[PDB]
Amino acid sequence: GVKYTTLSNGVTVATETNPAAKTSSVGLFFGAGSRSEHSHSNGISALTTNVLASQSAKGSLLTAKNDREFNGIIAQTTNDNITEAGKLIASIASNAVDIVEKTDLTKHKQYLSAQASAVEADPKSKVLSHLYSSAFQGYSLALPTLGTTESVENLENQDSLRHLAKHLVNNNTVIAASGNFDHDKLADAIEANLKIAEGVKPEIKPASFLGSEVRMRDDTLPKAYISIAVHGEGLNSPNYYLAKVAAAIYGDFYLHSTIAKFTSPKLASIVQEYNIVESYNHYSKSFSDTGIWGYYAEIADKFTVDDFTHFSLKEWNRLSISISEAEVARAKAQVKTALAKELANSFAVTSDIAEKVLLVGHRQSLREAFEKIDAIKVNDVKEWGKSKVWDRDIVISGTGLIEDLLDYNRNRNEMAM
Amino acid sequence: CMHLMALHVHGSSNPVGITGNIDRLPMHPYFIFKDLITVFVFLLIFSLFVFYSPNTLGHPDNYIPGNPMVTPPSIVPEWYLLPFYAILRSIPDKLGG
Ligand SMILES: Cc1cccc2c(-c3cc(C(F)(F)F)ccc3F)nn(Cc3nnn(C)n3)c12
């Protein structure tokens, strides 16, 4: 029951109603993430969402969803309490400006700054967050999704009120829902309670990929954390699933897992001849119009970083040559399962449906995605590999024990032979 | 080869005269291509001398068939031994020289 409803105003209510859902959730999203910020007001979108999500809930779980592109509040409740949750968020939005005007942001800013610092403490989140910025340096997409410390303390109620009035508008906002409930009842409940100002959809600020390297050598850490990625296909791109399929070809790996010695990806077998890497993760991060395809890796040995980057990038070359049918069949199946796994929780599908409805204007159910992935032949992957991987510029990030990570020209040169 | 190993044990110095360990780069490609630049410059100048002016560095008298009975007016080494031979000329004693 993916059906959509457009209120008297331009707000679209997209609901993935489905029986046998363990719990239901509703969330209002407006397409203003760090993408739609600038360095002076960075993190305002996260801060203004946290303030709204911090409001008292009538037994519902308000949580803030913060992302590069979209941002909103999500309420999770049992299936019978969904309508109360729906009316709740409409109350939050209609009173958004009033709530923020009187709200004291000092405590919220402390929470947001603590979040941003905690992101920096965690090496993977730092590496990925740095990786995304380095690729898009100079554009708004480079801004951290939760912002940075020094940026946050300069935030003031005026900054967020300007942000909400610009972005929290009918044309730039969507309402997402999921669970075992009647769609019409939720839609009627929202219409009778949601009152938000009209406005034009803010133009999405452009961003362009720039291959670069950001090194944060940290000799005190126990392991070397590195991520290498290229300009992968983002949302609303016909290769969106193809990029995910390519990533699953190399998949994931964790040296201390019972599956390590017995996993399919070739790179996994290669790295175990020397225990080169402790864990690595291939991913296809996709934004509204831009995507980053690559891997993340944690290396517990100072002397094997170059070996991994050499072997991992060598394996990327095989996308355009000598890629096996079995690998594609494996990657297609793995992606399909991973795609379906993300949509299990009602919370996750609510976030997902909100993202697509904002950033692409339409959504594909698993039925359509499976029909698309199933049609991916080996040639399509190889053509994509040549297009997006072979001899294409990479972006490199790394924080710990980076001394052995050879400089750009070495890693970049490995992308072609 | 021995000189290369004695170099490799401690590595090469730098103009600043401080530890290079803070910022090292692999010899390939950077310094390989710098070596190619200097090699092509050297070969270009070497070609200038070899083809267009080969005998300027040498001494003309060396093209006279040697005979012990005739002493040339000036017994002098090639240019690059001159600094040492000068010393040999300056010191009176042959052993001291
Ligand atoms: C022609 C001539 C005259 C006087 C001295 C020399 C030397 C010479 C050789 C040595 C060494 F003991 F090392 F042999 C040391 C100092 C010297 F002055 N050499 N020669 C011919 C020459 N000069 N340059 N070359 C390529 N050969 C002389």
Mark whether A227 and A175 lie in a shared domain.
no
Quote the CA–CA distance of A76 and A27 in Å, as a whole number. Answer: 8
Determine the Cα–Cα distance for residues A212 and A232; give it in Å rounded to an integer.
Answer: 15
Q: B71, B74, B81: which to mutate for ligand 1, most atoms within 8 A of CB?
A: B81
Question: Are A114 and A137 in the same domain?
Answer: yes
Residues A331 and A304 in one domain: yes
Q: Is B60 on the interface with A (CB under 8 A)?
A: no
What the block records as the tokens of A85 is: 């949750």
The answer for residues whose C-beta is within 8 angstroms of residue A169's C-beta and 6 or more apart is A30, A196, A197, A198, A199, A200, A201
Q: Which residue of A has its CA nearest to B28?
A: A410
A186 and A226 belong to one structural domain: no
Number of residues that this document lists for chain B: 97
Q: Is B8 a catalytic residue?
A: yes
Q: What secondary structure letter does DSSP report for A230?
A: E
Q: What are A130's two structure tokens?
A: 């740095």
The reply to whether A187 and A336 lie within a common domain is: no
Give the closest residue to A243 by CA, choosing from A297, A144, A316: A316
A292 touches A128 (CB < 8 A):
no
Q: Please name every residue paired with A282 in a beta bridge, in sequence order, or none if there are none.
A: A295
- Using DSSP, state whether A6 is helix, strand or coil: strand
Provide the number of structural domains found in chain A.
Answer: 2
Q: Could you tell me which of A214, A400, A247 has the C-alpha nearest to residue A334?
A: A247
Which among A333, A340, A316 is positioned nearest to A392, based on CA atoms? A316
Which residue, A158, A139, A142, A130, is CA-closest to A41? A158
Residues β-bridged to residue A394? A230
Which tokens hold the place of A141? 């997409």
Helices (H) and strands (E) in chain B, counts: 3, 0
Name residues whose C-beta falls within 8 Å of residue A380's C-beta, 6 or more positions apart in sequence. A242
Phi, psi values for residue B93, rounded to 5°: -65, 135
Per the CB < 8 A criterion, the answer to whether A65 and A71 are in contact is yes
B contact test, residue of A409, A411, A413, A414 with most B CBs within 10 A: A409
E-assigned strands of A233-384?
252-254, 279-286, 291-299
| Structure token pair of residue A132 | 């995304």
Report the distance separating Cα A401 and Cα A299, nearest Å.
Answer: 9
d(CA A53, CA A111): 13
Q: How far apart are CA B88 and CA B84, in angstroms?
A: 7
- For residues A296 and A129, the answer to whether their CB atoms sit within 8 Å is no
Cβ–ligand 1 distance for B77 under 6 Å, the answer yes
Helix, strand, or coil (residue A152): helix
Burial A182-218 (b: 16+ CB within 10 A, else e): ebeebbebbbebbebeebeebebeebebebbbbbbee
Distances (CA, A) of B56 to A137, A186, B47, B50, B64: 58, 99, 13, 10, 16
Q: Roughly how many angstroms between the first and final C-alpha of chain A, as a whole number?
A: 50
Return the ligand 1 atom nearest residue B79 CA.
24
The Cα A191–Cα A90 span in angstroms is: 8
Ligand 1 centroid to residue B69 C-alpha, Å: 20
* A113 and A242 share one domain: no
Min distance B33 CA to chain A CA atoms (Å): 13
SS3 content of chain B, % helix, strand, coil (to 5): 55, 0, 45
Q: Are residues A363 and A332 in the same domain?
A: yes
B75 Cβ below 6 A of ligand 1: yes
Q: Is B29 on the interface with A (CB under 8 A)?
A: yes
Cβ <8 Å between A413 and B29: yes
Domain containing residue A137: 1-194
Pocket of ligand 1 contains residue B78 by CB under 6 Å: yes
Please identify, among A194, A214, A241, the residue that sits at the C-terminal boundary of a domain.
A194
Residue A186's nearest CA partner among A341, A410, A382, A5 is: A5
Residues A216 and A335 both lie in one domain: yes
Calpha distance A380→A412 (Å, rounded): 24
| Cα gap A46→A25, rounded to integer Å | 20
Which of A194, A214, A246 is the C-terminal boundary of a domain?
A194
Q: How far apart are CA A60 and CA B29, in angstroms?
A: 60
Using CA atoms, how far apart are residues A37 and A133, in angstroms rounded to an integer? 14
Look at residues A161, A194, A227 and tell me which one is the last residue of a structural domain: A194
Tokens of A342: 């993300």
What the block records as the tokens of A324 is 């096996």
Q: Under a CB-based contact definition with an 8 Å cutoff, are residues A352 and A216 in contact?
A: no
Would the CB atoms of B30 and A409 count as touching at under 8 Å? yes
Shortest-distance atom of ligand 1 to CA B76? 3
User: A5 and A326 in contact (C-beta within 8 Å)?
Assistant: no
User: Could you confirm whether B61 is annotated as catalytic?
Assistant: no
Residues A219 and A94 in one domain: no
Distance B92 CA to ligand 1 centre (A): 18
Residues A180 and A204 occupy one common structural domain: no
Q: Are strands A173-179 and A12-17 parallel, antiparallel or unpaired?
A: parallel
Q: Kindly state the tokens that stand for B88.
A: 């040999």
Cβ neighbourhood burial of A256 (10 Å; 0-12, 13-18, 19+): exposed
Q: What is the rounded CA–CA span in Å between residue A320 and residue A304?
A: 26
Residue A187 parent element (H or E): helix A183-191
Pocket probe mutation, ligand 1, options B85, B89, B90, max atoms within 8 Å of Cβ? B85
**DSSP H or E run through A77:** strand A71-77
> A49: alpha, beta or left, given left = phi > 0 and alpha = psi -120 to 50?
alpha
Question: What is the residue type of B62?
Answer: N
Q: Which residue type does A100 have?
A: V
DSSP alpha helices (H): ranges in A193-298?
240-250, 266-271
Question: Which residue in the list B13, B28, B34, B90 is annotated as catalytic?
Answer: B34
Residues A285 and A176 in one domain: no
Residue environment code for A354-365, b if the CB has 16+ CB neighbours within 10 A, otherwise e: bbbbbbbeebee
Task: Go through A139-168 and write b for each residue having 16 or more CB atoms within 10 A of its CB, e for each that does not.
Answer: bbbbbbbbbbeebbeebebebbbebbeebb
A55 DSSP assignment: S
Residue ranges of the binding site of B: 3
- Whether residues B26 and A410 touch (CB distance < 8 A) is answered with yes
Instruction: Let me know if B94 is a catalytic residue.
Output: no
B79 lines ligand 1 (CB under 6 A): no
Spatial distance between the Cα atoms of A150 and A42, rounded to a whole number of angstroms:
10
Three-state secondary structure call for residue A43: coil
CB contact under 8 A, B26 and A413: no
Residue A269's Cβ-count burial label (10 Å; 0-12, 13-18, 19+) is middle
Question: If we measure between CA atoms, which residue out of A6, A32, A88, A379 comes closest to residue A204?
Answer: A32
Burial class, A78, CB count within 10 angstroms (exposed 0-12 / middle 13-18 / buried 19+): middle
Measure Cα distances from B34 to A7, A84, A302, B11, B24 in Å: 68, 72, 29, 18, 15
Residues A232, A151: one domain? no
DSSP 8-state code for residue A400:
E
Measured at the CA of A24, the angle between CA A21 and CA A26, to 5 degrees, comes to: 145
Whole-angstrom distance, CA of residue A126 vs CA of residue A142: 13
Task: Decide whether any atom of ligand 1 lies within 6 Å of the B30 Cβ.
Answer: no
Nearby residues of A412 by Cβ (< 8 Å), 6 or more positions away = A211, A393, A394
DSSP conformation class of B30: I
Q: Which residue has the tokens 């006279």?
A: B64
Contacts of A77 (CB under 8 A, 6+ apart): A23, A24, A25, A26, A59, A60, A61, A84, A85
Give the C-alpha separation, A193 to A93, whole Å.
Answer: 10
CA of B45 to the centre of ligand 1 (A): 25
Half-sphere exposure of A395 (CA within 13 A, CB side): 25
Contact A305, A405 (CB under 8 A): yes
| Cα–Cα distance, A325 to A379 (Å, whole number) | 10
The whole-angstrom separation of Cα A32 and Cα A44 is 10
